[PDB]
Amino acid sequence: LVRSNAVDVIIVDSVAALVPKAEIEGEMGDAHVGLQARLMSQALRKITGNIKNANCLVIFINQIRMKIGVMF
DNA sequence: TTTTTTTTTTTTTTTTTTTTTTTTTTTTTTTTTTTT
């Protein structure tokens, strides 16, 4: 959509819910340490250069997931 | 009978033998439990 120059505002609701295809194919709790993070990092690397050229918005939506082992 | 005298011209190719080198990471995820 963004590369087409047609649409100008794009919304991705709850980026946390876009599971990888590999994780879907595999069983529950197999592993997939950070695969979501790798996917998200690779996505931006490819679309940042097209978003500026197409003058679009890609407002992403996120969730609050409390972390462990943090005191202060 | 006596009695020798002088060279002239090039034609043709034939066959390949041998490898030499790696190069770079990429990414987090999720809390549990009141005690007197």
Side-chain angles (χ1 to χ4, degrees):
Chain A
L1 273 66
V2 60
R3 174 201 309 83
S4 79
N5 312 51
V7 50
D8 293 330
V9 178
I10 296 83
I11 296 185
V12 165
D13 188 320
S14 190
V15 67
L18 66 96
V19 85
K21 150 152 61 72
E23 180 175 357
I24 292 183
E25 309 215 340
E27 63 96 28
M28 321 285 278
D30 202 333
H32 292 346
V33 278
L35 171 43
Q36 182 65 320
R38 159 148 60 229
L39 214 161
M40 261 295 318
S41 165
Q42 177 173 359
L44 280 71
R45 221 192 297 118
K46 310 243 277 244
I47 65 181
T48 183
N50 298 91
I51 271 166
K52 179 59 180 300
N53 157 285
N55 292 328
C56 308
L57 272 301
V58 277
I59 168 178
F60 293 128
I61 290 279
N62 233 329
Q63 330 229 271
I64 288 305
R65 300 298 175 84
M66 297 208 18
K67 64 202 311 303
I68 68 180
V70 85
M71 300 64 88
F72 313 131

